[PDB]
PDB file of C-alpha atoms and ligand atoms in Angstrom:
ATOM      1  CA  UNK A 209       0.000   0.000   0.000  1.00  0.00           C
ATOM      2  CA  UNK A 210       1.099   3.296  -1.029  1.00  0.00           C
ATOM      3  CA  UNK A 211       3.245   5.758   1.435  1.00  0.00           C
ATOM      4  CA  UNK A 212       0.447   8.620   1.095  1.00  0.00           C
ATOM      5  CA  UNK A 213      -2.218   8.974   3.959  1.00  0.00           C
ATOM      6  CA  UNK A 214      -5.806   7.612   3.485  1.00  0.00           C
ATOM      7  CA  UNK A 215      -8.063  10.971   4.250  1.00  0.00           C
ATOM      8  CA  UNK A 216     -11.289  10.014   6.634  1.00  0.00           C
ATOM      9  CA  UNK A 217     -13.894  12.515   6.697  1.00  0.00           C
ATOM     10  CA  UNK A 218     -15.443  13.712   9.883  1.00  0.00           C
ATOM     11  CA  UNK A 219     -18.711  15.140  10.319  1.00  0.00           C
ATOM     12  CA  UNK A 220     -21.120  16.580  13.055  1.00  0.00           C
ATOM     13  CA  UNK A 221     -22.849  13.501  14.668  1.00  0.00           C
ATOM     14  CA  UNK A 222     -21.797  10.786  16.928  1.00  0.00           C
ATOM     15  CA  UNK A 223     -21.770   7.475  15.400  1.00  0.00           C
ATOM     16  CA  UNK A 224     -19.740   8.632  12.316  1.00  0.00           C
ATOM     17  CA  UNK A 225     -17.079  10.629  14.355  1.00  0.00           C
ATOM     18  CA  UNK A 226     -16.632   7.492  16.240  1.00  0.00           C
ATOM     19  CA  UNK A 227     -17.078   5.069  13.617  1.00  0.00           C
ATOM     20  CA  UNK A 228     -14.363   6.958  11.825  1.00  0.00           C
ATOM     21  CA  UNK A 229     -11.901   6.747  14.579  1.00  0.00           C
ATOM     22  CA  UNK A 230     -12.926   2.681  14.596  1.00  0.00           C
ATOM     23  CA  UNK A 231     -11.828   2.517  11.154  1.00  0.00           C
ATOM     24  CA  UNK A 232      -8.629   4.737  10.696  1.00  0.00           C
ATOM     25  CA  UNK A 233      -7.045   2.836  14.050  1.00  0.00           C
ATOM     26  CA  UNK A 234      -8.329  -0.380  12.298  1.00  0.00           C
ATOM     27  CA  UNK A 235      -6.026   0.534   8.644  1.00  0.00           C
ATOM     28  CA  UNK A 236      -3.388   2.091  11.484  1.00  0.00           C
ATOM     29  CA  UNK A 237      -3.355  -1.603  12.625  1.00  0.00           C
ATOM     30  CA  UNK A 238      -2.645  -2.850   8.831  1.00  0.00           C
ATOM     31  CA  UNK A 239       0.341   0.093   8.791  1.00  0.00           C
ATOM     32  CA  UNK A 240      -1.238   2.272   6.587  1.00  0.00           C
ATOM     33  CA  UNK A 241      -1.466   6.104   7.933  1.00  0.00           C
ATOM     34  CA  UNK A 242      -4.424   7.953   8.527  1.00  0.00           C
ATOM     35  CA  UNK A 243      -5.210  11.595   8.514  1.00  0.00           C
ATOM     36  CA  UNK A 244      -8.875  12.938   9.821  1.00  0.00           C
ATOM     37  CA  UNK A 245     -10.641  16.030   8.531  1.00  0.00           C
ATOM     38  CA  UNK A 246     -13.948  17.506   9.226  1.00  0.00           C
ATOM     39  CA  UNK A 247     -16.266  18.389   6.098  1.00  0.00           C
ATOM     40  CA  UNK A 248     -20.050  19.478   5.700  1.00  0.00           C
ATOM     41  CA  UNK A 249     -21.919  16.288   5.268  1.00  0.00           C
ATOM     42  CA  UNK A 250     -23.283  17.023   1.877  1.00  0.00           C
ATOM     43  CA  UNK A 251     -19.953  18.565   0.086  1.00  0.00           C
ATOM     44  CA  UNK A 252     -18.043  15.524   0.815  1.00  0.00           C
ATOM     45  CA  UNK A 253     -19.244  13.664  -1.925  1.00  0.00           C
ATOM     46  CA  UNK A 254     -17.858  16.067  -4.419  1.00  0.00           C
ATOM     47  CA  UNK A 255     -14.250  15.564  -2.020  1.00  0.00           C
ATOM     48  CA  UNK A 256     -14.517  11.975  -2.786  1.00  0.00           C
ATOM     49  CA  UNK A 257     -15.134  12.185  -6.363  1.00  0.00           C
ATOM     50  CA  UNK A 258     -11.881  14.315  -6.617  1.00  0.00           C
ATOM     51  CA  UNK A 259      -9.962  12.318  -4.300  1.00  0.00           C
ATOM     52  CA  UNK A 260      -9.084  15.322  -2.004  1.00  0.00           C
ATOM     53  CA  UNK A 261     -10.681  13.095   0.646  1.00  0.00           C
ATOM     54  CA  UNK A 262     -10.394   9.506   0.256  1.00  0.00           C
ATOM     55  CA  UNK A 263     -13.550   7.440   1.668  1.00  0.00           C
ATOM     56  CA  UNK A 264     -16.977   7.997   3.069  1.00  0.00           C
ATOM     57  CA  UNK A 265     -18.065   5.315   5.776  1.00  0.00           C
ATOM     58  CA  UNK A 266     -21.666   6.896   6.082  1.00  0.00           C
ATOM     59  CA  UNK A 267     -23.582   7.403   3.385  1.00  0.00           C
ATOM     60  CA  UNK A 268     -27.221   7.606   4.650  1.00  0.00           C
ATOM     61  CA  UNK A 269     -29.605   6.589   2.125  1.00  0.00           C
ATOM     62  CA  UNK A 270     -31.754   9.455   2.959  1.00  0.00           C
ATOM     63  CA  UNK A 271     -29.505  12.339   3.980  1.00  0.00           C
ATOM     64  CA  UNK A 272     -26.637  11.738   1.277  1.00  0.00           C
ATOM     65  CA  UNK A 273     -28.057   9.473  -1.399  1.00  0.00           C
ATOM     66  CA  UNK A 274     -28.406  12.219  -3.538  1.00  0.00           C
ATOM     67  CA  UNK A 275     -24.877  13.972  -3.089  1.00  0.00           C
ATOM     68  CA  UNK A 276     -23.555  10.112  -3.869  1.00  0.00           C
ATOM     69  CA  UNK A 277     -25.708   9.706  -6.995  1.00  0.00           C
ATOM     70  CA  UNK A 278     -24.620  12.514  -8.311  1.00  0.00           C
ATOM     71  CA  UNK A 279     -21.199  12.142  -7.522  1.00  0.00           C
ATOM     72  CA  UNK A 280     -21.131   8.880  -9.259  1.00  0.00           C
ATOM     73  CA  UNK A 281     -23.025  10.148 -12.341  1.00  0.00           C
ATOM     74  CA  UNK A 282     -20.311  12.755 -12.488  1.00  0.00           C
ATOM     75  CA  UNK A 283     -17.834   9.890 -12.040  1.00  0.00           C
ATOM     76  CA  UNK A 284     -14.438   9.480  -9.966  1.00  0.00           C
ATOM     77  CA  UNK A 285     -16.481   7.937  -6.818  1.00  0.00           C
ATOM     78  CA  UNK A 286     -17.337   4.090  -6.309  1.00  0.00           C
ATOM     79  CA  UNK A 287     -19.672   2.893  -4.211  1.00  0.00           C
ATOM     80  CA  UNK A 288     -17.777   0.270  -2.069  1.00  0.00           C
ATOM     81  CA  UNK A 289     -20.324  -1.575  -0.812  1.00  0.00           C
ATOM     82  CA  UNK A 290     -23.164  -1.443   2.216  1.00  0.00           C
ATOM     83  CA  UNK A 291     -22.864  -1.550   5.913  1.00  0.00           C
ATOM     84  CA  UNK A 292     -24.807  -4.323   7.331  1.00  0.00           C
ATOM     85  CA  UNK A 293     -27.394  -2.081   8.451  1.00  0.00           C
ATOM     86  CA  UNK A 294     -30.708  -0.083   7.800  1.00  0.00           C
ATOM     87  CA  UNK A 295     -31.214   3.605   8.399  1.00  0.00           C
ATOM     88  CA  UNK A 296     -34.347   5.930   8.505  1.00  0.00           C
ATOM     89  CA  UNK A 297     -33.649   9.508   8.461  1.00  0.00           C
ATOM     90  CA  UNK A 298     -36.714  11.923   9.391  1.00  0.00           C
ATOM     91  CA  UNK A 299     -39.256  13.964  10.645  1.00  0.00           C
ATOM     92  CA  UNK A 300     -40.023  12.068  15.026  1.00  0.00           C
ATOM     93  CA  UNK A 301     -41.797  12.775  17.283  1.00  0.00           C
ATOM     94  CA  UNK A 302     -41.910  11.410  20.930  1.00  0.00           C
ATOM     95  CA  UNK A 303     -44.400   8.506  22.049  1.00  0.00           C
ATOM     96  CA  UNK A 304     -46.087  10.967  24.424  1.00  0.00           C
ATOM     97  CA  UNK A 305     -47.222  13.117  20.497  1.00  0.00           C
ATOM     98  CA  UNK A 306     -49.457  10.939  20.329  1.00  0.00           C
ATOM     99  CA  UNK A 307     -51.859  12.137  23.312  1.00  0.00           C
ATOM    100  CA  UNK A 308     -51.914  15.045  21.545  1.00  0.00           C
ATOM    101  CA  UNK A 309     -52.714  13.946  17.990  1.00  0.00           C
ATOM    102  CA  UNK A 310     -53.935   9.937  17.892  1.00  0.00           C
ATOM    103  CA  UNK A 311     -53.967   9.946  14.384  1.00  0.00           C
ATOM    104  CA  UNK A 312     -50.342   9.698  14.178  1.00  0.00           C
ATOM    105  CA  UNK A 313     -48.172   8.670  12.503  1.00  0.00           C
ATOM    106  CA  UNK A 314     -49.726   9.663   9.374  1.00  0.00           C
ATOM    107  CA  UNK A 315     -48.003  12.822   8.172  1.00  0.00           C
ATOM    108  CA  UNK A 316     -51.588  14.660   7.608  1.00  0.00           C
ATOM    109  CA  UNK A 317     -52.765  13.895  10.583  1.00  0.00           C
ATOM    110  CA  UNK A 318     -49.509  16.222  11.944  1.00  0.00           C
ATOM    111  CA  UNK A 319     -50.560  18.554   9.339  1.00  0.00           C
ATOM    112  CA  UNK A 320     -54.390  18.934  10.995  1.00  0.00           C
ATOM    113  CA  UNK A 321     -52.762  18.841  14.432  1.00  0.00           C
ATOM    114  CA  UNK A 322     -50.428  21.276  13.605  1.00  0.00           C
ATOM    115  CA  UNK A 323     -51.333  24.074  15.676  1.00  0.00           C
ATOM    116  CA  UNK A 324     -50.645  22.333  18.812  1.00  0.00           C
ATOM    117  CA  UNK A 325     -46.564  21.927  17.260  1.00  0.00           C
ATOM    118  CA  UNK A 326     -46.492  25.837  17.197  1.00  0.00           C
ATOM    119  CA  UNK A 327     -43.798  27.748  19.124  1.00  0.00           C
ATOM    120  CA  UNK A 328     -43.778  31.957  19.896  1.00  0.00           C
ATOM    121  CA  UNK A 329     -41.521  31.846  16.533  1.00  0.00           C
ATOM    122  CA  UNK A 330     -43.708  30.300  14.190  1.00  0.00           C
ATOM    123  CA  UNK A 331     -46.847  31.776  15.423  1.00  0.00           C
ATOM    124  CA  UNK A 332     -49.716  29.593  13.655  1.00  0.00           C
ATOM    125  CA  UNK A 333     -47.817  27.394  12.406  1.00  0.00           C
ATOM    126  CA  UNK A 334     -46.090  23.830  13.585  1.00  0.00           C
ATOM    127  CA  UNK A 335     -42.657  24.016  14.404  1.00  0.00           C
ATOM    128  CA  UNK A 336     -40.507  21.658  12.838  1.00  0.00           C
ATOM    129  CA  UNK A 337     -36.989  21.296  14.260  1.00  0.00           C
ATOM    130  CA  UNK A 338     -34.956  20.397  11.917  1.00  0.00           C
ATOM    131  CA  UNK A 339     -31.000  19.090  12.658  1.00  0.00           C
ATOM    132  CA  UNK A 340     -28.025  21.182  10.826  1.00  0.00           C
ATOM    133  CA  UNK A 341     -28.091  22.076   7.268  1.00  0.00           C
ATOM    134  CA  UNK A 342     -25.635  19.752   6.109  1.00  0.00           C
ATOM    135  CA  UNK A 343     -28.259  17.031   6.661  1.00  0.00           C
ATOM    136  CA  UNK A 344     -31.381  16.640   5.379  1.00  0.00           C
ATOM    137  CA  UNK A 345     -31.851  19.602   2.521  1.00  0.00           C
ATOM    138  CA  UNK A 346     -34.706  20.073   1.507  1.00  0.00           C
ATOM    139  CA  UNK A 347     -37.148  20.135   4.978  1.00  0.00           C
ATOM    140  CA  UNK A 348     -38.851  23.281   3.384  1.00  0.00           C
ATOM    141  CA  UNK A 349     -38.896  22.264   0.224  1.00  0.00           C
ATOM    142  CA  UNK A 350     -41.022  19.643   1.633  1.00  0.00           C
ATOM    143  CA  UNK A 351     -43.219  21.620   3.546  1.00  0.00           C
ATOM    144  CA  UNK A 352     -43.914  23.163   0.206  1.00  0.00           C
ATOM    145  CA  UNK A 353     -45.023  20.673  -1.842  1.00  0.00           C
ATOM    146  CA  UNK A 354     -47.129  18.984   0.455  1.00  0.00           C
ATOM    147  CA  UNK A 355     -48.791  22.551   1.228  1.00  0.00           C
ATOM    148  CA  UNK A 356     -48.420  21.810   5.208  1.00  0.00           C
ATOM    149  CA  UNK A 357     -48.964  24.206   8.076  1.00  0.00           C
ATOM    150  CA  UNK A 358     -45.344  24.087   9.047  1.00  0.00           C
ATOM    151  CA  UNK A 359     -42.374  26.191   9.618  1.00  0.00           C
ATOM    152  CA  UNK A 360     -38.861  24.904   9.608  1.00  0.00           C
ATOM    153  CA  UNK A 361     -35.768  25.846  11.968  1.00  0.00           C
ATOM    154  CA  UNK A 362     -32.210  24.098  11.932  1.00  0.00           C
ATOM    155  CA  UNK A 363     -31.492  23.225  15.158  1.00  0.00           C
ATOM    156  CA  UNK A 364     -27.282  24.393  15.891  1.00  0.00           C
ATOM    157  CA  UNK A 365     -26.104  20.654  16.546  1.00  0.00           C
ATOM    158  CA  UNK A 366     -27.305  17.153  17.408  1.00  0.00           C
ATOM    159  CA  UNK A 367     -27.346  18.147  20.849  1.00  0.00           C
ATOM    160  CA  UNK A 368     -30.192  20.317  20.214  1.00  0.00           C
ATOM    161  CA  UNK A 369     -32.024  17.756  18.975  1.00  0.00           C
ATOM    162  CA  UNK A 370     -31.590  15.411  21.880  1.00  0.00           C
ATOM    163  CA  UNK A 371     -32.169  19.175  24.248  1.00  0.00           C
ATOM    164  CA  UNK A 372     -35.843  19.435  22.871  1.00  0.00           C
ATOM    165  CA  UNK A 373     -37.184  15.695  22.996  1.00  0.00           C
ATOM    166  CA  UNK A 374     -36.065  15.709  26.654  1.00  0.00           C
ATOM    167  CA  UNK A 375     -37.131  19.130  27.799  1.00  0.00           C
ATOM    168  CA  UNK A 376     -40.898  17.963  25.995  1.00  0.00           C
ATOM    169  CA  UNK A 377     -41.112  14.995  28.523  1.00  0.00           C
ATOM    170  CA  UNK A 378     -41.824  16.720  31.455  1.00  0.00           C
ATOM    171  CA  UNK A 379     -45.346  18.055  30.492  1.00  0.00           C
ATOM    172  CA  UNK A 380     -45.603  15.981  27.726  1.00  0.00           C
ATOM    173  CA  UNK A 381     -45.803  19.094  25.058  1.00  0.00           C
ATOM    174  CA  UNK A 382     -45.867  17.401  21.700  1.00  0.00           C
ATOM    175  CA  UNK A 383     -43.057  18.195  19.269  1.00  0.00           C
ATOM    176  CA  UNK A 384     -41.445  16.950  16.303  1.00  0.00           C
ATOM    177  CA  UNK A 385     -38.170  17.117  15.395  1.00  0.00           C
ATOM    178  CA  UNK A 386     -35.296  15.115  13.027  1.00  0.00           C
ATOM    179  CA  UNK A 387     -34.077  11.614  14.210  1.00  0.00           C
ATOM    180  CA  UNK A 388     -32.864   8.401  13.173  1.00  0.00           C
ATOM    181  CA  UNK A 389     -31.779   4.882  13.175  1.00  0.00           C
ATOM    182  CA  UNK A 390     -29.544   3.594  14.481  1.00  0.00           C
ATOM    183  CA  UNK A 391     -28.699   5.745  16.809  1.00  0.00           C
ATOM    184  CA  UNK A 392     -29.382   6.356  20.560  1.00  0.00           C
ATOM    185  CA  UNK A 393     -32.103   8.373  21.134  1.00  0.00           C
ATOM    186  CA  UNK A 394     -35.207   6.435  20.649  1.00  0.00           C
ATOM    187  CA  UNK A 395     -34.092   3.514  23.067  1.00  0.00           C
ATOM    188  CA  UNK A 396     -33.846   7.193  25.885  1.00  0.00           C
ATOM    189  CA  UNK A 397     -37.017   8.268  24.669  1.00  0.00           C
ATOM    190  CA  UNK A 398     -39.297   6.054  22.201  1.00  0.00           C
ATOM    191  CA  UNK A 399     -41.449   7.155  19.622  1.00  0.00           C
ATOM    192  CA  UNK A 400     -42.000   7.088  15.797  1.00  0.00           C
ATOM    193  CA  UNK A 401     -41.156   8.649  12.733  1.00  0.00           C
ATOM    194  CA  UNK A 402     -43.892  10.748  11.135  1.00  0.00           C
ATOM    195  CA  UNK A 403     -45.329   8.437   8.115  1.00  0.00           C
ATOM    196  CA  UNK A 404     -44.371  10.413   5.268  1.00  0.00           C
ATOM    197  CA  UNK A 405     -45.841   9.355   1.589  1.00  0.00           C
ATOM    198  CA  UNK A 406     -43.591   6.234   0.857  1.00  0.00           C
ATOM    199  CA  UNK A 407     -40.406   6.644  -0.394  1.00  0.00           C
ATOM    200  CA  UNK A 408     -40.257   5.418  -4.215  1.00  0.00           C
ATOM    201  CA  UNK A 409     -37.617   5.518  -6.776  1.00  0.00           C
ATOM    202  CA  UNK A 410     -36.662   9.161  -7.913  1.00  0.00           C
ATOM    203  CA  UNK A 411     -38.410  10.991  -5.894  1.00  0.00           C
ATOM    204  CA  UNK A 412     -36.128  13.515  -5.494  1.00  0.00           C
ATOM    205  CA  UNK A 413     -36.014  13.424  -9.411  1.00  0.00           C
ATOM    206  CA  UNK A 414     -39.512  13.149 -10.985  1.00  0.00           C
ATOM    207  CA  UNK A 415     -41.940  15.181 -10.232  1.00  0.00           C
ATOM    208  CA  UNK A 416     -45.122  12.662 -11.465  1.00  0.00           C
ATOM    209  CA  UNK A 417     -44.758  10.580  -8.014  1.00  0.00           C
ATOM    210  CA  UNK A 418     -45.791  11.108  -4.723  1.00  0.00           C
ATOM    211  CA  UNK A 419     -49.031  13.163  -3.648  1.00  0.00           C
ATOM    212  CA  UNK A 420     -47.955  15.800  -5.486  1.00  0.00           C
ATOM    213  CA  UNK A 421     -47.954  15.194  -8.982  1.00  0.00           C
ATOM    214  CA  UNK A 422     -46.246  18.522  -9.542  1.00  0.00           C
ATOM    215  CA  UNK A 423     -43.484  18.845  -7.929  1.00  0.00           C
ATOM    216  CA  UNK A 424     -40.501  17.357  -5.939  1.00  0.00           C
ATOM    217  CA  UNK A 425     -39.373  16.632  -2.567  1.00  0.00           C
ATOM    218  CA  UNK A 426     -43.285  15.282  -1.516  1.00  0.00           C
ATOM    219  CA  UNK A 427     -42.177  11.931  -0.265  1.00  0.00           C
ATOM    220  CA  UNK A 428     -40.924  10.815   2.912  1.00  0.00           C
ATOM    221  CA  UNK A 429     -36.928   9.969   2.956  1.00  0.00           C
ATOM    222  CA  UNK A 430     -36.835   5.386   2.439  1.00  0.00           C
ATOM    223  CA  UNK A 431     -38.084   3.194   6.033  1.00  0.00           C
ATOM    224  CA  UNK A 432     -35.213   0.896   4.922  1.00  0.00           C
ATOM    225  CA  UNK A 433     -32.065   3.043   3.773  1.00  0.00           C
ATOM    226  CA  UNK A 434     -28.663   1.804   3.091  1.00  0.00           C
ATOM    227  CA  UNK A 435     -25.914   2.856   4.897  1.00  0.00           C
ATOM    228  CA  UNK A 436     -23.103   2.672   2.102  1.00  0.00           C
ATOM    229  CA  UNK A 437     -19.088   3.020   1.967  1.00  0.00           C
ATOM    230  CA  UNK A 438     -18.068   5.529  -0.528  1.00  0.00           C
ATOM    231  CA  UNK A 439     -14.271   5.436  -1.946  1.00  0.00           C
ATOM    232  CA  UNK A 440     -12.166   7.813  -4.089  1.00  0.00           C
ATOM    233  CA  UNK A 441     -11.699   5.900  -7.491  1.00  0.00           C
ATOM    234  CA  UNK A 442      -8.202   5.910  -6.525  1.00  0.00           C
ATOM    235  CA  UNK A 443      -8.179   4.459  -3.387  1.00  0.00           C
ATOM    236  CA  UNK A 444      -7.999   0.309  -4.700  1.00  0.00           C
ATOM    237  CA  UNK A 445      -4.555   1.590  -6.877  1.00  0.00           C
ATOM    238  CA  UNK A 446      -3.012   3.036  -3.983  1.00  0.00           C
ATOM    239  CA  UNK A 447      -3.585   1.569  -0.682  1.00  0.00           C
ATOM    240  CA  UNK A 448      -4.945  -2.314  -2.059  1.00  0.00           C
ATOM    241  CA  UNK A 449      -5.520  -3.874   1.302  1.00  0.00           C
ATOM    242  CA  UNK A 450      -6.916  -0.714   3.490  1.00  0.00           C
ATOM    243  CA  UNK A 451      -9.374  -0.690   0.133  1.00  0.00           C
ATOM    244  CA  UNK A 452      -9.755  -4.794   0.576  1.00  0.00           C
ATOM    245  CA  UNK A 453     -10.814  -4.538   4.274  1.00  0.00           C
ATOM    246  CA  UNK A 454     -12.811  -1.136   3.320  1.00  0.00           C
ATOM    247  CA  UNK A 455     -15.055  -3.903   1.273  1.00  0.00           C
ATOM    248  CA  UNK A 456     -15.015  -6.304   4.557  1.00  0.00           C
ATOM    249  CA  UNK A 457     -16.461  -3.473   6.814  1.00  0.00           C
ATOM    250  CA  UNK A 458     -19.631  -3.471   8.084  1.00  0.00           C
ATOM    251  CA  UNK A 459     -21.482  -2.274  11.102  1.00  0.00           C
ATOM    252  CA  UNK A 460     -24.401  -3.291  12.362  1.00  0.00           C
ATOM    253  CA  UNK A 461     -27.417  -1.225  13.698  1.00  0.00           C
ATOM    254  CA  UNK A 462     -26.634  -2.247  17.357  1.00  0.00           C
ATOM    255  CA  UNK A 463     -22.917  -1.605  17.374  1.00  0.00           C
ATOM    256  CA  UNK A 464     -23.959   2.257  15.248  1.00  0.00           C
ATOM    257  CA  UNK A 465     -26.366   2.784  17.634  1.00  0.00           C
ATOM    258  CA  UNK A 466     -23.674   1.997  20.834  1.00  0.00           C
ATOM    259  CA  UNK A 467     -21.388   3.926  19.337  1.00  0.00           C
ATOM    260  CA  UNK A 468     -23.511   7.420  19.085  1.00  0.00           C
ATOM    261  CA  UNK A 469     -24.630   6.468  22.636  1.00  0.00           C
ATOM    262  CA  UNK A 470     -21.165   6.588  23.745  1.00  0.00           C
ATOM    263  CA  UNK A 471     -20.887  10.599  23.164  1.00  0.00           C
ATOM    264  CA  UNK A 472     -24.047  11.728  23.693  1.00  0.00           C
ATOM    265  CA  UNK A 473     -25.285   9.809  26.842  1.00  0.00           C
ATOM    266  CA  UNK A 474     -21.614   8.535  28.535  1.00  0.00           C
ATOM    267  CA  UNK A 475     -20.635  11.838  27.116  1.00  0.00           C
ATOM    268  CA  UNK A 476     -16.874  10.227  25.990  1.00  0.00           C
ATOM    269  CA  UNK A 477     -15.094  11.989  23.290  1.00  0.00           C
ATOM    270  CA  UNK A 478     -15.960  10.579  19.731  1.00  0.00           C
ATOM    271  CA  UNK A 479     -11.662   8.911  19.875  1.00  0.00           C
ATOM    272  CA  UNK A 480     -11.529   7.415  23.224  1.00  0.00           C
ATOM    273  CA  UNK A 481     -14.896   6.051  22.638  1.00  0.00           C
ATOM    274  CA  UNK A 482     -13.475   4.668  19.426  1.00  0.00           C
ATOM    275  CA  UNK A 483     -10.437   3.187  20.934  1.00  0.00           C
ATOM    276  CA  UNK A 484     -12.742   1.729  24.198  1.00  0.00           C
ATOM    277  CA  UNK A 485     -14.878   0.476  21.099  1.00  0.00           C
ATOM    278  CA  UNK A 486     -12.039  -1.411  19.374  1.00  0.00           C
ATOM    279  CA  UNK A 487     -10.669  -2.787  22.264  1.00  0.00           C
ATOM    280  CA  UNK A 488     -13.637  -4.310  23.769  1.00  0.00           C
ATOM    281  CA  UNK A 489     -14.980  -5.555  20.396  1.00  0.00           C
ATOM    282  CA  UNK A 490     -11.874  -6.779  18.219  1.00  0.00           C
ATOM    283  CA  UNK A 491     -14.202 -10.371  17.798  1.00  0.00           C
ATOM    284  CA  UNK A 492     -15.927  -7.693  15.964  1.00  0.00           C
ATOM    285  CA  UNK A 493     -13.266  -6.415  13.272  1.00  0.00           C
ATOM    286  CA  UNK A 494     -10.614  -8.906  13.768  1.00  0.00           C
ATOM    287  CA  UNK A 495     -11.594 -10.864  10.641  1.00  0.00           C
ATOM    288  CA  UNK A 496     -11.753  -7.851   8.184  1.00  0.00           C
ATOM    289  CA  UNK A 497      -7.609  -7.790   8.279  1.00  0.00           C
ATOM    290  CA  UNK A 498      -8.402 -11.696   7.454  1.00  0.00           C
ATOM    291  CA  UNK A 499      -7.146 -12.787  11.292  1.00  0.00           C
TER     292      UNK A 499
HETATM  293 CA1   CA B 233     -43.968  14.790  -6.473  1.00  0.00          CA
END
């Protein structure tokens, strides 16, 4: 494998921060340098395709899937394979919503309860909280084209995210704000994803689907999302084995999940969390360097 660093992306929530650090001590292991750097989660993709970053190890179906597709249309990026695991990415609320508005999960049932999602800042209408920018893009967009009475806000951080759901449970105030799986939260405080119209192929593409015939960005992100491994079409020429094991891994739902729990409830830093990780689950990775 070449003398050149392999370039790991780093982002703004907790699983892929540590999952990161999992990986680049796992190719340190193999002898082949590492070198992290943080990007926005969308611009990456673009990085990759380029090779001024090397790899992605998260590519969320519903949060990047677009960024990668076009990426690989424009060529320069392969898609290295899937994690063994399945993601949702969207719009939750807490069980506790549901006192509020029984008709949930169904999106339009939201929609009529909306006024009870309101906050001083959006007046009359629901308050969606949204997480950073860099995430899911097109929130209003969406609000749009399925004529809803919501308003959208990007929460600062993840923390945010996790700040709201747990300062609703005290009175039970229904709110709805971004989430996914696997990941922590939900198993701290369970709930649902709002049923959005079904993801289908190109929605984000052709305007014909979904309940609005007219334009896009109508449907819900998919229930069962990929989590892929993106490469830099350089990356098998240079650095053959770190790309070989790149193919072997693959993490689960439980172990994603543990790792974002690490940071955000036993409040580790994203590294040491990824070295406890490694070291109390090498029967986990062991047999991706073939041993
Ligand atoms: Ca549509």
């Amino acid at each position: 494998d070449s003398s050149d660093p392999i370039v790991i992306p780093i982002h703004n929530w907790s699983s892929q921060i540590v999952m990161s650090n999992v990986v680049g001590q796992i190719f340190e292991e193999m002898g082949v340098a590492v070198e992290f750097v943080t990007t926005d989660s969308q611009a990456v993709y673009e990085s990759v395709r380029l090779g001024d970053v090397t790899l992605e190890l998260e590519v969320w179906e519903g949060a990047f899937g677009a960024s990668f597709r076009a990426a690989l249309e424009k060529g320069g990026i392969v898609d290295v394979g899937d994690h063994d695991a399945v993601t949702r990415e969207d719009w939750w609320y807490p069980m506790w919503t549901k006192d509020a508005c029984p008709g949930l999960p169904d999106w339009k049932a939201l929609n009529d309860c909306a006024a009870v999602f309101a906050t001083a800042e959006t007046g009359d209408k629901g308050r969606y909280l949204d997480g950073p920018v860099d995430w899911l893009k097109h929130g209003k967009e969406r609000v749009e084209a399925l004529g809803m009475n919501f308003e959208v806000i990007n929460a600062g951080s993840a923390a945010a995210l996790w700040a709201e759901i747990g300062a609703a449970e005290a009175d039970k105030r229904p709110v709805v704000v971004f989430n996914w799986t696997p990941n922590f939260a939900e198993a701290v405080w369970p709930g649902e994803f709002v049923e959005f119209p079904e993801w289908v192929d190109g929605c984000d593409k052709d305007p014909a689907v979904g309940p609005n015939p007219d334009a896009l960005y109508d449907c819900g992100n998919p229930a069962t999302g990929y989590l892929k491994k993106a490469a830099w079409e350089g990356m098998e020429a240079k650095w053959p084995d770190a790309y070989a094991v790149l193919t072997r891994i693959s993490f689960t739902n439980p172990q994603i999940a543990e790792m974002a729990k690490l940071v955000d409830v036993d409040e580790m830093e994203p590294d040491e969390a990824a070295e406890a990780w490694l070291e109390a689950n090498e029967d986990v990775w062991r047999p991706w360097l073939d041993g």
